[model samples]
Target chain A: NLYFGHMFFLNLKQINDRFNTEFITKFKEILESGWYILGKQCEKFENNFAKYCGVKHCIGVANGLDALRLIIKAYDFKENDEIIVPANTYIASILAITDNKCKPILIEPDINTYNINPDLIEEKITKKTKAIMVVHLYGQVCDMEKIQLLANKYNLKIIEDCAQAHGAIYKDKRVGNLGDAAGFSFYPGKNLGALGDAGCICTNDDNFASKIRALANYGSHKKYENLYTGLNSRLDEIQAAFLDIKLKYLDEDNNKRKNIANFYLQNIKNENIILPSNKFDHVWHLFVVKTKLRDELQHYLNNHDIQTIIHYPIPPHKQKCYKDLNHLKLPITENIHQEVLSLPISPTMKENDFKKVADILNKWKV
Target chain B: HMFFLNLKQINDRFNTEFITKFKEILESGWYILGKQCEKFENNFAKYCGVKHCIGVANGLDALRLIIKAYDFKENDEIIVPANTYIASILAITDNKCKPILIEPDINTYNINPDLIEEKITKKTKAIMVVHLYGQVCDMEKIQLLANKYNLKIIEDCAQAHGAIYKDKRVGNLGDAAGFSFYPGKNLGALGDAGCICTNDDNFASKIRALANYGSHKKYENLYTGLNSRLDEIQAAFLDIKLKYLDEDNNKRKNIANFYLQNIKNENIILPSNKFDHVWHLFVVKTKLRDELQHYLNNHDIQTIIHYPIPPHKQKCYKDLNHLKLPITENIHQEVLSLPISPTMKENDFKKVADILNKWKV
Candidate 1:
């Protein structure tokens, strides 16, 4: 029996290799400068990323969680004040809410789109609801217009979790611009990723921007003088420099992902597999498909030397950390968790590679 | 002009190694919580003579995670030094715990262990002793006090990377310690990085899980935690620099000794050397701190105040603004940190000493 080499999901090495030379040059420059935290590189990246997102300001942070955490922290929401969030999103979204001692009111995601169900948001909102955190899950933009209307009607803020939706668009506005304030994660696997853990917040509100900038840097607008009890979460200068270099190519890279997503959508055929809705605006961060036989399909893919992963094996509500929330039934989220599997998708994916994945999926049997 | 702590000069020594590691890690495609981080954690843990070291985002988070892992209830008090950096107090408050500020000993500029007992009440859960300016706190006395009150001891080893007290390192002395590798520290990283050190297995595991999004295993969160992890590239850089920490610290000690022996100025009060001090900063106190700073600047020397404002007096801590902390206030007003670095030239040291001795109040 002969077998081809394993096809890994998202080859970060291949993606980063294109910019290796430039990254090294920038790394040397940053090392020579000797100013690592909150220096010129961060300032430049913030300016460039804010401009790219069409937002007034961007504040660099330590990671995606801190980006969301700082946005909520800047609001100074009272303890147990409710923040409506998606049940199907990553644990970080809910963690940000509870990290601030606030209640995370979980709303289910739409079955087809897998984005937050905006229609279900208002029913959960009470007098304590301070914000609606819409996660652009799996590089697809949420239905922000309906979410915005609800926010306006209820006087609640909209916080965008753009960790998966870098450069993703809704109508004409970008993901970060659609909400009151947005958080972007540049984790190594992100569309426009840094070499290490990094993130930033974008907003048009000048006061919110300043508050977040200060809050991220120990709440000190001036050196050695703090205005609030803030934690240290500044974006590293080298990471910022790397992100800046990668930001220039983000749109092109995202388009490559979209093309591969389209190829899989057009070619792949399996009676057991359910494809994601193609109508939505997506950057294809993950080409996730659902099937009742997810485990068997994953095993088959493994035998064929093709890698696959579940977006999440467990939902936030059911996690051991949130035991109290385990009783709450979110059928759509639970089903999605049990059935969803992410196929290999990346800007670095070769035509033969994605084609092989699509061909293998078509051959997958119950 | 003689500068105060040229970072480029300090880091240039390992530029080749840093670049090599950076390239390798970048090409490796594994960044967060990877092999580099694991190696550095093990290396750092061994260096500090502790059983475990969990690499975190920065010193503040290191301290914050330690407190969070202890599961201290909200508003429960933790005794901390009023004169220390705001980060220490921030960690206490970040967990919704109260920071009961105790004054530092005027001589050692560390938390006064003698003043701690009076503040220990029913709610006091821990005593956060900051090893300010790389000087290890009088841990033996503090440990005795902690034992008497049945309280935990957390050492803020942000400044004291390799400091020792009674043949034990700072991180090993306390129950758990937070070490900062900020670019300016004695064992500085190229960027913001830190680690938590502890001998308690349960606490170490809790902190490790807490720093990595509360997950001992990936996608399995056991607690609500922060997204704080020391980056792989940073860990690699820090590991390389860890090899030279003691040698670098000894250079700083030599410079400090020279300053102590010379600089005979009646108006200036040098730091009292009573214990094993790594001399993170060669701080001096003078009534005319402002004038001395100005004079030093005029003489082509750059100096800085470790902090000009105490935490309680800061605009953020408005509730505690009314309380009187004369010792902290006096220290803040009178203290000025002279230029001190591992890479300082002998001639610059002589120049600084000569300039200081001729200063007129």
Candidate 2:
């Protein structure tokens, strides 16, 4: 079986007119309230999201990168502090660490799960290590219990990049509830998302919460008074009201993905391609398959009018934008770079669409 | 700071035209920043006699980008008038740069150019000149000093709109200028908004990039940048009011001239009559400021203090100094700003003068 990230393109068209009517009403309220930034609507959604994730506070920001930046800064890590990050992740995760002046130590993923390997983290720890930024990749958690033990022994703060694992569960622990502070992206395409790019940081620390509030409002907790260096990064009411509506059905929607994964697991017996293994506790954010012939297969799939994507085409440490990191070798990340392809497992996909996906994979000659 | 003065002055001040235009923009499906901002920027740049304009989210973001654009390294010094707003100093500090706060001259209430040389060091990269109280600061001396030291200058044109220094307008006289249309500035926007003006096209383009997420085009973030942007509806409102800014500034000047000669108070320290100042505020200094504010409040007159505590003394700015600034510290305690908007009526102006005639320092 195959799956893309989220079926916003297919599903949103049917509900676009009705969704706009409901959202534009709140749009008028936010515009007239003269409170374009964080206001009553943002506050309401924050509370609702926190309750959804079983967390105490949900702090909204401009985007996911900023959400991570604020969470990293709130920990008050020093410049010399080593921040453990996955070498296989997106550029944004590394960018957050770099922007905050913290050194990002890249950890390679294990071959089986393709999540940040917990065994590698213990070896990466240094005396200056102050935090670990573990990512829940492709909607499944790594060994959180062992990773937490390493952090506990080293006195390191843990930051979860839950941008991919938006409503997923691991051992009854939600993605947001397992870490010190977690960041979520609502970039129009997330399983639970908004109309545009938006994000939030979930934490219960009052001091951190107040700091983020003042941080997004130009260093002024009070209006017209400049206390320190702050910025303007806020999620508006329109996105918030829309997200609130989507949050209600996110769990039921994730269940739709589970059925698709079960069907894919039972078929498509091939020698060269390796199918993704899923635990029942996992939420299927993407139905990706690994094949040595990914470069040729992806092009062939596109030529057949079927759309798909790679989670990441390159490991972050190897990207040209960050050449200073060339000396650090991530073995598994380098190998997985060209071997992965995402299949469409979107909630909006019909049964006929799923049949089309699997038939294409089964009928591939080369 | 008095940009929203006529909000209550004219009968249909925020009229149906504004409402209709706003609804049209909201309905047109473009919400973030687009054509409305482009039109507003073009008009504003033309009005200020500058070559280009880059509208942003607010005044602080405008100043923030100026410092950010200069790319001053950590520990580099920026010369800012110690008597200026905290937002100006905060911009530099937020960028990990140092602010070398300088004293204001007694009469002009702007940076004392004579004292600036004393604070200059090898690390001083730029000087931020603030034209406080809706009038131009002495740009001639500051510009020369900047040329002599080979430093950049950013005009904090937050208060001075249509204010002239000699024959030059405030916004066009510096390397770059930050103007706030904070719904309460001289050329105010409906909500928090501002613009950066420059003669250099490259600087204008960079600021346009900086106000967005540093992308030259859309979605290709070339550099790590800010997310602050001027809203579309606010831009349309600014275009409507931009046409009337010059006339409004002149009206304010006329009311300022009235208070200059007719207040009849020996205790007041009136503004110097040397420049064609657009009186954004009619500030009076007196030991009797507390009593006068109380007296004016009884007559249904709303007055504000331009600043009660100078920027250098604000706790956020406590990093600025340990030595006491006798001049700025004294000015903070004695200054009171009266209503000096273009929207002020003749009856209200005379009533204010009547109270001043019976008062003394």
Candidate 3:
């Protein structure tokens, strides 16, 4: 890892050549066709995505945020209704909750699993609370068995933020299908990404899917026949045609990531270096480790050209937007920003290269 | 033959430079509502002899956003016409404004300004005037009444694009004007498009921000604005169409002139053109309208019932518990838009006239 000088990061581009050629050609063709918005391409992609995820329906949207916004708006969200969000999460998770005028009741993350702790979620429940949203953070699927029970017990719906965990399985079922509906991002860097921004919601419930489609498409089900109010959150047809090409290689590329993750788990020698542990199905979107010597190790890695990242450098409540939410104490979440660091575990990281990272951890001392 | 509402005539006359500008914007990536939209707004405003134009997603949104911009309380009565398009009134109700309907005078098909004054009440905040069927709603009469009564006058200029009234264009004739650029209008876009023209700079600025999620630049959302953007791609397409509007409209004017001079249908009551009218639709009324429509269809001609159903018939609007509309039914079944496209061939005119002559009900 250190021997490769001037390199601090790596990306998984196993199908880079095929993805680039196919994506470019498809983009050129779609552009030439002169149908850029919701057209035949978007419809075909939605159908393909639904079949791919083993769901009966899928709604392609402008972004992952818009997909969540579509469901919230379609569900006829009341102004004061609350959706439970994981305390430890990306700001877009909170943005989706706020965008639809719904309040987010923060629940602490599960300490061992690093997801929304299903045990603590019930404490925040009320008559106004209608949903519990869990994230499959970094390719690790959430505790669905517990989440499903809690959702049913409290009469709350479960929504999974599956931005990182594409094609990941849980108890022999895919992460996308386990929840009521899931939000996925095809940000250029995602496991199943497009060149530009695009995303969708995969769902089996036909009614919910229909409502979301209506809400995003000018609230119209037909030409000049408006049913409700909606915004312009459409997946550019250019991006969908490109995503069709990238979706083919995602599973194989994810498997390669698994092999790299396995090496990090077994080969790293330091007991002080806390290895990430989860269910065997994890794709290791990031190979994270915890350490008290986070800054010192970061400097050492920097010197050796071994780049790593802190899962977050700042907790959500401390961010300027969440200043009003300063009262919540998320114990595990507070330390995660400081302790969590991701080693170079992208798909492109060679087995020999991973051994070099293991050698740095092996040689390290407090 | 009636010209299917066209803009190419207008383009050939006044849009050469404008269409060139549109094609040049190919793949500019800056396709979201931005500088080009602002420039069009400014240029259109100056063209209309007004200070501002707020480009929007469609005509419906222009009216809806204007109502919301005024911050009207729910159920505040906004008067609309009886025989106008449902989209006109739907805009009012979508903003939670209550609707009060007025009947059209069969002569002009414009919202009856004489009838508008009779319905004004303490709850009436604005009067929505449809410059219906490419004719201006008597603005001098409507604006005088609005000014005297302290009510806002809105011109739904979806039909009247560049026709001047008392020396000023239709869009500048009122407090706010909504011009829809549906593909078949005097000024058409490739698809649905519209802009709100107003001299009130405050209202104009608020609306521009309103359509774009309240952000002028990327991601700096100032207010909670819905994503009702007039996309750059559409704008690029529109620039092509806007250039030819004047030229295309002249062709429509010529076609309307031909029907007036040549067609002699005993049952049909031809339109009254007191001023320059750009015929978006050339309609001929007949009691045998159904059979005539069938005959025209067999002859490969196209026509529409400008609207066969008024707002009162829509299941959503009819369910309003306390609402009522009086004379909408009278005009609903009578108005017949005959074949009219700016690009119509010469051979079709004699055929259209002969078909109309046979329908002597």
Candidate 4:
């Protein structure tokens, strides 16, 4: 019998191994400090993240979902108000809308970039439309220039879902700084992931920053003095400390991801496969490719000792949670969901690993 | 200066064990709702004598998820103690349910069971009973009232952990309970962490789904749920600390006994040591609370008010500001919490008692 090693889509253990020493040192310091919630660690990371994102304020929240939820709550948008969002993005983006009792206006993504199509946004806008929630899906920045133009003409607020695109840029601005507010998820799998569930909101609005800060801390600016209805979603002090240590290496890691993505994009040449095209800056959170035979390709990769995953098999509109919108037909999103597959790509991946993946991709056949 | 609660000292006792667990969890690379959370939940459920426990983000989310899982309609009344922390009220209001304020028993500083019947009405769906100051409420009486009205009893076990009443733990007393493992609690996590305990298997399953983006399975969301979960690191820390919880509570009880036996001042009124309490806070009533707090501060004994304002008086709840809750108001005005913890030294306890005894009207 012969034994072969299996490749994971993303080896979180390998990605985190480099930071274990720093993480332990910081964890010990946090334990000694004894201040967990809203402590100095969270404050320092918030400031550092804000500076990195080129925004005036960054409020640490419990997770990406809450980061977006708090931004909507802070806006105080009326019930049943419309918020434009991408149909094919993660369910969390739409959940944030429905969680606030607001209606989600789903816009299909661009077929190539897998980001919200800027052209489809304006037609969906109505007098009830309060904001446009742009999701930078697959680590690629959306067409913010055109999206911002529509927002300006329609007098709509722009909220960025930067869960996948940390350190990704568009023009001279970053993903977070391109909109009114942006929610970043430092989930363990993201490019700038923390050890656990962590997220933050970035914005230049002073009022929104203060409101969101209090909103995450049980609506209390001062202890026991609540000014608004809020949720307990403050970022954990230890997670914040870990993120601060990791934030220093985000650009370097993201650059590594870009290099791996470029190698795949340049080397993998198959008539059956469709490569991801980037018209804007991308950090390659997930190096997703499209193919009509996604399942067959996935199985073939598994047979070759390589693991793969579908970015999503079901769109948000097709989810059981959104049954009311089940009747709505979105062809582009359905196609994207059906054809997209995420291959193994990580900052820890070496040149040989990418070469092996590329060779396997080229060798695959029906 | 002596602090109200020295978290650094309290957590320092388990430093080596915590560091070991922290490293193990770190190397595992599984952070959210992993093995540590499951193990802690099972252990905690067993500890509380309950069938199920679902860990969440914090105490507030624990209560919030309980209310959310119940699927109560908007404007439905959830009767809560007007004397408890604002977090209890925040959970009720965050779900868009109206919070009907009921005053506490002036002596126990818990929801007054005698007054609960009057608050029961057509729209009243549940009662959120908070075990304030680490003491279990009169559950035997309160349970009867809940049964009579056919109302779901949701116990806010934020302060009370390991508290027994009538041979039953606090988390198992009500239909469902929310426990906060905040760093300051008697049984606390190092960071934000909490859980819900229930005997109902269906409700437990619902809460489990509700906390994890409302999905019973991956990519299959049944309801609109929030992202609230207990981290593996915090759970590992909690699992280690949970074994020593009884010992820590006993130490807290000994300190409370010391205060009860020694502190002698006419103007200062001590709390009633009648219930099975964990002594999360050793609160006392005094008309000259500010003066006594100041005097104790000068003596290097730090103190804090359990709460300075009632929920009705809060600026957020302006509509309820008109309602007068006199008993709740009086308790809020007069109650002061002296420094008490499992890690307190004998000399510090003696010093606090001596200074409190020396205070005069």
Each model: TM-score of chain B?
0.98, 0.94, 0.89, 0.98
lDDT of 1 by residue, B99-129 (tens): 9999999899999888999998999999999
Number of clashing residue pairs in every model? Answer: 0, 8, 20, 0
Listing every candidate in turn, what is its Cα RMSD in Å to the true structure after a full C-alpha superposition? 1.8, 5.7, 7.5, 1.7
Model 4, runs deviating above 4 Å: A1-4
The residue-by-residue lDDT of candidate 2 on A1-366, one tens digit each, is 552133221343332333555665665565556544466878889999999888988987766777887788767778868899988876678777876788999988877787888888888798989899978787877678988888899888889998877878777778888878888877655677665447899887777778877776666686446565666566755567768877777887778877877677676666767888864366777777899899888877787767777876766676554668766777789888779888877565677767767777788878
TM-score of each: 0.98, 0.79, 0.70, 0.98
lDDT of each: 0.91, 0.76, 0.71, 0.91
Residues forming the 10-long window of minimal summed lDDT in candidate 2 chain B: B2-11
Ordered from best to worst DockQ, the candidate numbers read 1, 4, 2, 3
What is the Å distance of residue A293 in model 2 from its true position? Answer: 6.3
Better of 2 and 4 by DockQ: 4
Q: C-alpha displacement of B314 in model 3, angstroms?
A: 0.8
Misplaced by over 4 Å in model 3 are: A1-42, A58-120, A128-145, A154-203, A206-366, B1-30, B33-50, B177-194, B215-221, B273-276, B321-326
Regions of candidate 2 where Cα sits further than 4 Å from its true position: A1-17, A31-38, A110-114, A137-143, A163-166, A184-199, A221-228, A234-315, A319-321, A334-366, B1-57, B158-171, B179-306, B335-361
Worst-scoring 10-residue span by lDDT in model 4 chain B: B24-33
